[PDB]
Amino acid sequence: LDFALSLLRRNIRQVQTDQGHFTMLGVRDRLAILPRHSQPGKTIWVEHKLINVLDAVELVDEQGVNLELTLVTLDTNEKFRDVTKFIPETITGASDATLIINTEHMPSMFVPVGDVVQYGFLNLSGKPTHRTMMYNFPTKAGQCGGVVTSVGKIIGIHIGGNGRQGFCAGLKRGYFASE
């Protein structure tokens, strides 16, 4: 709410890649995070502004397993308000999460997806993924990249769904360490 709005306004952006429309959380400085399937190229459009992508890291875990998250460093002066303090050290579920979506098609939208549960392994379109969580809410396409928040916590990034359920990549603060 009071946190979600602030987050929406200052850290969540409408984005397009060659793969379509996406929601993008900027975490700090010029570092933003994207669902892997957005596949950022050398450039992206952030709110219709064309922006060079300086670095794109596809996140993987210790077992080398796909986390379905892509860390991008963006070519812009303006820095993101640092929100790392709202991200938990350890991947954590929640009782009453809100999915924040912000694309051109779905502008500034909050979706009460309910309870976010620890799910773990997930076979996203054939490719194995780790550290996923789940929520019982018809999730639709075009909501990929949406930000799952709790009371003052950013806990995940929506990466897909099976019709009846939405799936998110769990967020750990350590993903966003400098170098």
> Taking the domains of the chain in order of start, what are their residue ranges?
1-11+81-179, 12-80
| Bridge partners (DSSP) listed for residue 147 | 100, 157
Catalytic residue among 68, 130, 158, 168: 68
State how beta strands 94-101 and 147-149 pair: antiparallel
Tell me, yes or no, if 68 is annotated catalytic: yes
Tell me how long the chain is.
179
Query: Entry resolution in angstroms?
Result: 2.2
1-11+81-179 under CATH 2.40.10.10, yes or no: yes
Catalytic residue among 21, 37, 130, 158: 37
Residue 128, Cβ neighbours under 10 Å: how many?
A: 11
Is 165 buried (19+), middle (13-18) or exposed (0-12) by CB count in 10 A? middle
Catalytic residue among 21, 144, 158, 168: 144
Pick from 77, 33, 27, 37: nearest CA to 55: 33
12-80 under CATH 2.40.10.10, yes or no: yes
Q: Please state the φ and ψ torsions of residue 86, each to the nearest 5 degrees.
A: -95, 0
Q: Which technique was used to obtain these atomic coordinates?
A: X-ray
Q: Do domains 1-11+81-179 and 12-80 have the same CATH topology?
A: yes
Sign of torsion over alpha carbons 106, 109, 114, 117: positive
State how beta strands 31-35 and 20-28 pair: antiparallel
Burial string for 95-118 (b: 16+ CB within 10 Å, else e) reads eebbbbbbbeebeebbbebbebbe
Tell me, yes or no, if 168 is annotated catalytic: no
What is the 8-class DSSP label of residue 47?
Answer: T
What is the C-alpha to C-alpha distance for residues 35 and 58, in angstroms, rounded to an integer?
A: 9
What are the E-state strand segments in the chain?
12-17, 20-28, 31-35, 43-46, 49-60, 66-74, 94-101, 109-124, 127-135, 147-149, 154-161, 166-170
